[PDB]
Design a protein around this ligand. Sequence first.
Ligand SMILES: Nc1ncnc2c1ncn2[C@@H]1O[C@H](COP(=O)(O)OP(=O)(O)OP(=O)(O)O)[C@@H](O)[C@H]1O
Ligand SMILES: Nc1ncnc2c1ncn2[C@@H]1O[C@H](COP(=O)(O)OP(=O)(O)OP(=O)(O)O)[C@@H](O)[C@H]1O
Ligand SMILES: Nc1ncnc2c1ncn2[C@@H]1O[C@H](COP(=O)(O)OP(=O)(O)OP(=O)(O)O)[C@@H](O)[C@H]1O
Ligand SMILES: [Mg+2]
Ligand SMILES: [Mg+2]
Ligand SMILES: [Mg+2]
Lengths: 146, 393, 70, 390, 130, 101
Amino acid sequence: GDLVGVNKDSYLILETLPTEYDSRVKAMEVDERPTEQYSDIGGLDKQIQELVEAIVLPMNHKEKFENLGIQPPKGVLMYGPPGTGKTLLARACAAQTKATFLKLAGPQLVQMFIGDGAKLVRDAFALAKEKAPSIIFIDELDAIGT
Amino acid sequence: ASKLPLVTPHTQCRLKLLKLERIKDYLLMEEEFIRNQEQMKPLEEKQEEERSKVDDLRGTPMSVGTLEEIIDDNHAIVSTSVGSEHYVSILSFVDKDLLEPGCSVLLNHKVHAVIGVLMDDTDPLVTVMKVEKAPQETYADIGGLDNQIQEIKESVELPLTHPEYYEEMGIKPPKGVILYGPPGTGKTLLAKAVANQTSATFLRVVGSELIQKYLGDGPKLVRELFRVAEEHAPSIVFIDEIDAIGTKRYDSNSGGEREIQRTMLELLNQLDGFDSRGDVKVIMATNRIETLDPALIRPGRIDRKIEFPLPDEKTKKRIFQIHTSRMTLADDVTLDDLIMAKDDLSGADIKAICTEAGLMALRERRMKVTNEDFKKSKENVLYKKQEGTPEGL
Amino acid sequence: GADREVQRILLELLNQMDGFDQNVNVKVIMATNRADTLDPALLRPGRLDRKIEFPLPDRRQKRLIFSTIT
Amino acid sequence: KTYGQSTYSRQIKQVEDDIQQLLKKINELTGIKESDTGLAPPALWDLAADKQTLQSEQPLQVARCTKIINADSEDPKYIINVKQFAKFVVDLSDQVAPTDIEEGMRVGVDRNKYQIHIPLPPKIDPTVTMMQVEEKPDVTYSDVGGCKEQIEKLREVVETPLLHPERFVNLGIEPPKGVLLFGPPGTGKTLCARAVANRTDACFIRVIGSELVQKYVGEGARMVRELFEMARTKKACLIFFDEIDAIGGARFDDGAGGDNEVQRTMLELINQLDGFDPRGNIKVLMATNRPDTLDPALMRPGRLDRKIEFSLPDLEGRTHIFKIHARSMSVERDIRFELLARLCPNSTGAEIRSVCTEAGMFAIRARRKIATEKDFLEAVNKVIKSYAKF
Amino acid sequence: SRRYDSRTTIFSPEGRLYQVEYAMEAIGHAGTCLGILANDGVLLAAERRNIHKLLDEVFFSEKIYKLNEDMACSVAGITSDANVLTNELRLIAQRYLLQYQEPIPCEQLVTALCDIKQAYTQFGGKRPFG
Amino acid sequence: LDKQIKEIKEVIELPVKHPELFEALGIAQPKGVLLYGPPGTGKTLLARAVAHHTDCTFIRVSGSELVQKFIGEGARMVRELFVMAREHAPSIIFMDEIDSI
Ligand SMILES: Nc1ncnc2c1ncn2[C@@H]1O[C@H](COP(=O)(O)OP(=O)(O)OP(=O)(O)O)[C@@H](O)[C@H]1O
Ligand SMILES: Nc1ncnc2c1ncn2[C@@H]1O[C@H](COP(=O)(O)OP(=O)(O)OP(=O)(O)O)[C@@H](O)[C@H]1O
Ligand SMILES: Nc1ncnc2c1ncn2[C@@H]1O[C@H](COP(=O)(O)OP(=O)(O)OP(=O)(O)O)[C@@H](O)[C@H]1O
Ligand SMILES: [Mg+2]
Ligand SMILES: [Mg+2]
Ligand SMILES: [Mg+2]
């Protein structure tokens, strides 16, 4: 399954190439690194504590979890009436963490052809795995999670 | 032929005579010059061999591609049959007024430069929708409408026939007309008559044909119906039986009601929206106008609203004569006796009466229709009433 | 386009099955759990003509199946 | 003959006929026969017979469209995907600088060594590229009568922040980026939209809600994404969603799936308007008749910050509308437009325009060339009263 | 509860009582009943809709009911509803006889029953007698 | 099938056997008829009987057959059907399963 450049006529392998990901999956990555401090979110202290302690803390202080012998939480879902500060907290987490961030949207994964959506999902997770510790944010989850 | 735009008063005037006399003088000069120069030297050989150079430039095996995008600098992206796309040069002998995305271009075999464009089929939906000359008949058959005929003419015919009247006052013609009346009064008949008597591409669509089974196809059908109505110069789009697609638009509904509402919204936008509608006239007919959408029949959308009443006393005689014209009758027919009853009879009912009378005469083998035959046919036709007697009265 | 190609396959199958001279011992057997969904062209005579049903065993068939399996 | 249209009518007709005949004679003498191969006129087989087609086929080679996928190392090494042909690892040409080529853009490549020669514009759906306005309407704010506060709010949402940006940065204000227009039919929502399109010195993209509804799953969302990417390409660009209620219906998923695809299109629109990524310099209008059916997420501030209400005009606004619509008409010197505005009870600008047109047509019917106050009164009686049931 | 109410006694947009219209359409299918008035008598002829080899013959008739010493009636529609109305007819006729000691005139008996039916179509929220 | 026989007589046989009553009444002759009912109820038999009794060719076609593979095969078949029916002066076309098309 690797990707290799070969001679046009001799068909001899000459160079091993970087993996290939869909253009959409590549666009899913964050390069501008938003700038929103936790202080810019008011009214949410328990929720911010939960999100940071579930996402950021395992990446930095993995020693605490390894010593206590407990696996870190797997996944955080944010729900509430519109305008309650969910995408804002996601942006704040992306700004404050320096690990790879993969922004994603629910409707972004629904595709015309059959199998393309699953292909996109698995490619996105593959890219996240390749690029060190990473965070995947799936906004508008209700588009596909019905 | 790309002649000067007079744009003088545009009404018969001395300034418009002078600008027009000048054009004629210049054209006379050009004609005399070309004639004399042709006599002096034919120049036919010079005109030829330029075509030979062109044919040399465009090789023998010209390939048919599909233009995808014009970079607007005599360059283009053209897709070959296999599916590949090339960035080529639009040569100077190709009529660029024909180039548009999706056109069938002729490509050079080796260099793939655009060297021509091919004509394309003429049936997006035109053959399916256009009615040609209405088979029914001309204005002669319609009897007893008169004022409605005049209103329809003032709406659709007069703007194309005498536009100076409108241009003088500066008013644009009324936008559209909606024909409403009880079932069987002549809405479709008048529409067909104007279609056959007019000089513009006439398109007919029944509202039930806009209820498609796949999401978005109703909106796409209306969009394309109005798309091939500006492509065909003056046109008249007659959406018969609008009541199927247009309705009070109650939000609390589920199923295909939402899709019908979306189709209606697209039709609304086409009738009056951000873009100018060009030169297209809309006619609509509906047995049931009270259930339509105020947004659908608001003034700016539909200006004129024509009422079609049931024939009363003499229109009935006229329809009877018209439908019995090509039918031999015995000299005992009391057509007045037939019509005298106040039976709310409709023109369609009269036509059915005549046809059934003829049919039963044929069944009995007779050579002429009789008054008793007409009476029995009328009784049979009026047998289709139903409903409850005491209820409602 | 996908459905069009599938319909092309079906039409070619029908054409081939009708293109028999009744002098070649080439027989076609076809098993389908959903015989209602089939296009009637297949059941048209000259094409598939023998419809054999394989119903759930009754008492006697159940007895015979039990005996032959045990 | 006719009743007499003008003393010069016969002369005009004769001169027009002579012009047509002379044009026919010139065409016949010069040839210019139609060609089925799409050849321009011989007078415009110009540089095409030779002298630029030759010098365009000789030096100008043929490049092939490809899409860059990856750039390897600092040293230029590009992976490209020639459509339906192959994929290569290719180098640049001496003419194109490395900064010009980025990941994901379309590049033309020569047929021999497959090296990049020219970047190309991004591929865009025809159905989304045709939404751009190109040619703007001729309407102006002066043609909208009876709406002063509404137009002021609409301007300060869509016009002033673009025209005088420093005025808001100086005071540290982030002006609203979206507005919703709602009211009874015929009040002037699309008219104000046309005025905004005309006045704006920026991209204006017109989107009709029914267009986003598509047969195949995941198509409205793709169109919305492409539209917003095209908008971001521009320095500042206005998007106008007319009849947004077509796809903005409230989320009501329950039991059997209902309008799930349209809801997904709506969700993508919401995400683009406000989401993780920062929306560009994109100001958004929306006009609708039933604001109730819109979803809370779409009607939330940050997506539709301002909600302008359009209502039937007052007596003064009706007078102004009457004047506006009678401006380009052949009318008498003194017509009491105030009297007409009073005589028409609560009614819309569409009704007033219909009244003006019907007065003109009553004149044309009576074979007059000047609409009279009596004609206007008859038009009012016909439109406002007789059609009062509609 | 408003949600489950059928609203059986309201007017339609075109001023029609749909429940009465449907009920009449129900009678349109029942067995045929025929009545002829002669100079020296009256008669009723009814299609005996029930016909089966196993049905027994009980009572003096299946659709012809005696209301008085000088009256009778036939019914077409819901059989159970007919039994309710025939009983009411017998009660009305005997109440008149008790009051006046004279048999009820036929027109008055019909009016009394029709008054009961009219009330059902106006108020009560109940279905009409089909 | 006697009722249908009488009806089809009046409908089809009259125009062909006696094409003068229609001319002298002015009522145009029917261009054809439609038959419908449950599957296998005598439609094709009745069509054959009418064709035999009016002494005309009995060209037959089916909608399923008209639904063919080659692009334009159906149009070509219809055109050939009508041209050959015209060639055979007295003719009766019996498109069988027209519902499909
Ligand atoms: N608790 C909060 N403190 C500060 N700002 C807030 C808060 N909640 C919302 N906001 C403001 O809301 C605006 C938009 O909110 P955002 O879109 O992030 O919310 P959301 O909960 O993700 O929305 P939705 O449910 O509509 O997707 C941001 O400008 C943010 O400033
Ligand atoms: N005034 C009339 N003169 C002549 N024929 C008439 C007249 N009114 C009705 N008809 C006959 O009625 C027949 C039915 O078609 P018509 O156009 O009249 O229907 P319509 O009024 O549009 O009805 P619907 O509302 O059901 O569409 C026509 O063939 C025409 O022959
Ligand atoms: N205030 C106004 N001044 C001038 N003309 C007006 C005014 N309001 C409406 N009109 C007229 O109404 C016509 C109808 O377009 P308008 O923009 O009013 O529709 P709308 O309110 O958007 O309708 P819809 O509810 O059907 O989408 C416009 O062409 C304009 O001529
Ligand atoms: Mg959010
Ligand atoms: Mg009609
Ligand atoms: Mg509008």
